[PDB]
Amino acid sequence: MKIDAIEAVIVDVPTKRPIQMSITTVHQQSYVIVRVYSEGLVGVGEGGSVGGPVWSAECAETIKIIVERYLAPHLLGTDAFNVSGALQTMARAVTGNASAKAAVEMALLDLKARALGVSIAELLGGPLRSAIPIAWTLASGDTKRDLDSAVEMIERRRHNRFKVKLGFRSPQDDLIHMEALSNSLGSKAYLRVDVNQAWDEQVASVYIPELEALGVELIEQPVGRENTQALRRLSDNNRVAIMADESLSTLASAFDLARDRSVDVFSLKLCNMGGVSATQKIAAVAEASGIASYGGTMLDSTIGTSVALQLYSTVPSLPFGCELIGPFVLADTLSHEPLEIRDYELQVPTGVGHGMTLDEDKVRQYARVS
């Protein structure tokens, strides 16, 4: 359909409330929406990082220039209906910068899907599920605060699973916070943790069993991202399911973790993996090796959460559901359509190509680099 022009703008949307992790506190969330105009029909997509260049090596300002100045040129005037070539071309243009690469991928995928009148889900082969159990993260520094916000979410019938962010406290203090949360939300809720790399193997070995004894069903990224050998030993010595998040990056790293089953669950993240096409391949090596598939997020807006939803509904199985709470933690949206949770599950949209139209008005209100 020949790409006329690929434009991109940065937009900063604040979080209703902070999200204190081990690596950074999320007071605001920056993005990069990529509008790929072609033959009259546009294609929206987005790419961004957490805590700037902290969760990953990318950030809002790096995403923009890598897109505009390095990917965009080689993509202008190219067949818009050829994602195979778009991705190949993007790999010969820049190294890494998966968020930037994924941002552009979404747009071409969205546009092509809309031109055919189908949805990203129907394009990938149709769904298998109409809704995926969403998890809620309790990352505020207060224990009482957490519990209260947690009890209400079970009442409002939207969140049955919980993801506690440990790490900012001492290994001995986080365990106590878990004795409290596990005590109250005992059987009424599911519990998971995400140490955000804070634990140094030894601390992980003595503390993982304790959390295991408290009924925690999944421990995400206990040790550092590169210590994939520790990630394995912990996995063989503990019955708990250990998920890889920061360690996952490229298709090769996915296979590297899957050889000796260094991990139990792969956390699928489009921006951390290079798009939808890249994620599917990792979900393929995970299925072959027998590793479960999750469904993470970079606390991305609706534009992202929607595309990721489309793709996750096509996965054979997500034994742990997902955590697409991006729009729900954000203080505002950049589209006219909202994603609605119904009975602890996030419902899959009913439109063509991630059924979300960018709110030009909402795009104009924030638009800062930061």
- Helix, strand, coil % over all residues of the chain, rounded to 5: 40, 20, 45
Question: Among residues 58, 105, 246, 323, which one is catalytic?
Answer: 323
**Least distance to Mn ion, CB of residue 276, Å:** 20
205 binds, among its own copies, Mn ion, none (CB under 5 to 8 A by kind): its own copies
245 binds, among its own copies, Mn ion, none (CB under 5 to 8 A by kind): Mn ion
Residue 359 within binding range of its own copies, rule CB under 8 A: no
Total residues interacting with its own copies, rule: CB under 8 A: 74
Q: Which two tokens stand for residue 219?
A: 């421990």
Give exposure, 86-113, as e/b (b: 16+ Cβ within 10 Å). Answer: bbeebeebbeebbbbbbbbbbbbbbbbb
Residue 105 catalytic?
A: no
**Residues 101, 165, 246, 269: which is the catalytic one?**
165
Q: Is 245 annotated as a binding residue?
A: yes
Could you say which of 40, 144, 187, 316 contacts its own copies (CB under 8 A)? 316
Which of Mn ion, its own copies, none lies near 66, with the C-beta cut-off 5 to 8 A by kind? its own copies
Please return the burial class of 280, using the count of CB atoms within 10 Å of its CB with bins 0-12, 13-18 and 19+.
middle
Residue 67 has phi, psi (to 5 degrees) of: -70, -70
Binding of residue 338 to its own copies (CB under 8 A): no
- If we measure between CA atoms, which residue out of 290, 291, 302, 288 comes closest to residue 267? 291
State in angstroms the smallest separation of the CB of 302 from its own copies: 24
41 binds its own copies (CB under 8 A): no
Concerning whether 323 is annotated as a catalytic residue, the answer is: yes
- Judge whether 133 and 161 are in contact, CB under 8 Å: yes
Q: Is 277 in the site for its own copies (CB under 8 A)?
A: yes
Report if residue 77 touches its own copies, rule: CB under 8 A: no
Least distance to its own copies from the beta carbon of 327, Å? 25
170 is in the binding site of which of Mn ion, its own copies, none (Cβ under 5 to 8 A by kind)? none
Q: Strands (DSSP E) along the chain, which ranges?
A: 5-20, 25-37, 131-133, 135-138, 161-165, 190-194, 218-220, 241-244, 265-266, 292-293, 345-347
